[PDB]
Amino acid sequence: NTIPIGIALAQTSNVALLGQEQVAGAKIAEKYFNDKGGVNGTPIKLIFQDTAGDEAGTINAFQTLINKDKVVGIVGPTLSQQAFSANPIAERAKVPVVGPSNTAKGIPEIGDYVARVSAPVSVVAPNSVKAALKQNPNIKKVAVFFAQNDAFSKSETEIFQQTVKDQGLELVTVQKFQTTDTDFQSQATNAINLKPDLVIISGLAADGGNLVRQLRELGYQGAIIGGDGLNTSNVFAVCKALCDGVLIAQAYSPEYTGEINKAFRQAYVDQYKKEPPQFSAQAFAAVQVYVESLKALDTKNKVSKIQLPELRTELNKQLLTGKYNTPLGEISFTPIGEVVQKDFYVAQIKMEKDGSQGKFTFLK
C-alpha cells in the first residue's frame, strides 16, 4: 500500500531541457524519503504524467493524475504559462498543487489549492543585475530581450527592466522574440547597433541559448545575464563555448549544510557526476513538502485510511502551515501559498573542453 503523488512536468519537448532536471530531483526525493520509511512506514509512489511543452499537454496530465491516477496532490507543472492554464483544474477538483518552478507573478493567486516552492522573479532576478554591476561597475547601456509568447518571460522581463532603470542605467532597447524562434539576427543586430554594455535575456533554454550564440557571433562582447529559463545544465549543449560567462541568479546553493541538502547533493553527484542544479533542488523540495505534510497528518490519523477527497483537502491545509528544512534552506508559506525564502545567489557559466562540458560556478 502506497500514497500516490502526481508529478506533472515537461518530460518531452524543448521544455524538457528544464523539465528533465525536475524529474531527476523528484526521483532522488522518492528514493530518499522512501529509504527513510516514507510516511511513517507507508511508502510514497510518484506517478509521472508528461505535460510536454504546451497548455493542452498540461491540461491532459492534470486531468489524468486527478481522475485516473487518483493522486493526493500534484508537483508541477514546469512553466508558469502551463500553470495558469492547468492549475484551475486542480483548484476545481480540490487537489493541491505545489509548483516547483513557476516564478511568474500571480501563481499563488490562481487559487487556495495552489502553492509554490519556487521564489518569484521579483526576489530572484535582481541579484544577477547586482552581480553584473559588481563585475563591471561601468555598465551604462542595457539591452533587454524577452519571449513575448511566454507568461514567465513577460513577468521576468518587467523585473529586469525596472531593476536596471532603478540602478540609473540606460535601457536602450527591449527586443521581442518567441520561445519557438530559431533566428534572432534582426533583434540581435538592432540591439548591438545601440551599443549596450549589458544584455539580459528572458526566455527558455533552447531559445535563450541560441540567442546567446547569435549575439556573440554578431560581435557582442559585453556582459550577459540569463533569466531563470536559461538556468539549466542542459543549456550548456545549446550555447556551447559561447555560454561562458553568462550570469544567472539562483534560488539554491549546493553548499548549504542542511542534512537533507547534504543527502540530496550526495545522491545527485553519485548519479550524475555533477553538482545538483536549482530545478532539481526545487523539485525535491516540492516532494519534501508533501512527504512531511503527510507525516504530520499521519501522526493524528493514519493516511492510508483517509478517503481521497478528505485527504486532498487536509493535505492542502496542512502543507500551507508547515515549516521545512529543504535543499533550498528553511522555507514556509504565506496564507496564499507564496514561498517564504530570503537567501539567493548568483552563478556564472564556466565552459571547458572546447565548449563540450560546463558548470555553474557560484559567485561568493
Closest CA to 287 of 309, 319, 253, 313: 319
CB nearer to ligand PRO: pick between 172 and 237:
237
**DSSP single-letter state for residue 235:** G
Which residue has the CB atom at the shortest distance from ligand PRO?
Answer: 152
Which residues from 221-240 bind ligand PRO, rule CB under 6 A?
A: 228-229
Q: How far is the CB of 41 from ligand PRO (least distance, A)?
A: 35
Q: Outline where 144-232 has alpha helix (H).
A: 151-166, 185-192, 205-217
* Cα dihedral: 105, 109, 111, 112 (round 10): 120
Contact positions with ligand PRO (CB under 6 A) in 172-231:
228-229
Among 84, 152, 252, 256, binds ligand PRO (CB under 6 A): 152
Q: Residue 294: which of 54, 36, 108 has the closest Cα?
A: 36
Number of neighbours of residue 323 by Cβ within 10 angstroms: 11
In terms of CB distance, is 119 or 235 closer to Mg ion?
Answer: 119
Based on CB atoms, which residue is closest to ligand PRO, 120 or 196?
120
Residue from 77, 99, 108, 358 binding Mg ion (CB under 5 A): 108
Got the DSSP string for 145-163?
A: EEETT-HHHHHHHHHHHHH
Least gap, CB of 294 to ligand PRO (angstroms) = 26
When CB distances are held under 5 to 8 angstroms depending on the partner's kind, the choice from Mg ion, ligand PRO, none that residue 72 binds is none
Q: Is 98 in the site for ligand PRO (CB under 6 A)?
A: no
Residues 6+ apart with CB under 8 A from 202: 144, 145, 146, 147, 152, 153, 154, 156, 157, 160, 227, 229
Report d(CA 238, CA 334) in Å as an integer.
37
Of 182-190, 246-254, 295-303, 337-345, which segment contacts Mg ion by CB under 5 A? Answer: 337-345
Q: Tell me the window of 29-37, 101-109, 176-184, 268-276 that interacts with ligand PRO (CB under 6 A).
A: 101-109
Considering only residues 3-22, where is the footprint of ligand PRO by CB under 6 A?
18
Partner that binds at residue 114, options Mg ion, ligand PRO, none, CB closer than 5 to 8 Å by kind: Mg ion
Residue nearest to Mg ion (CB): 337
**C-alpha of 259 from chain center:** 22
Q: Which residues bind Mg ion (CB under 5 A)?
A: 108, 114, 336-337
Give residues in contact with ligand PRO (CB under 6 A): 18, 79-80, 101-104, 152, 228-229
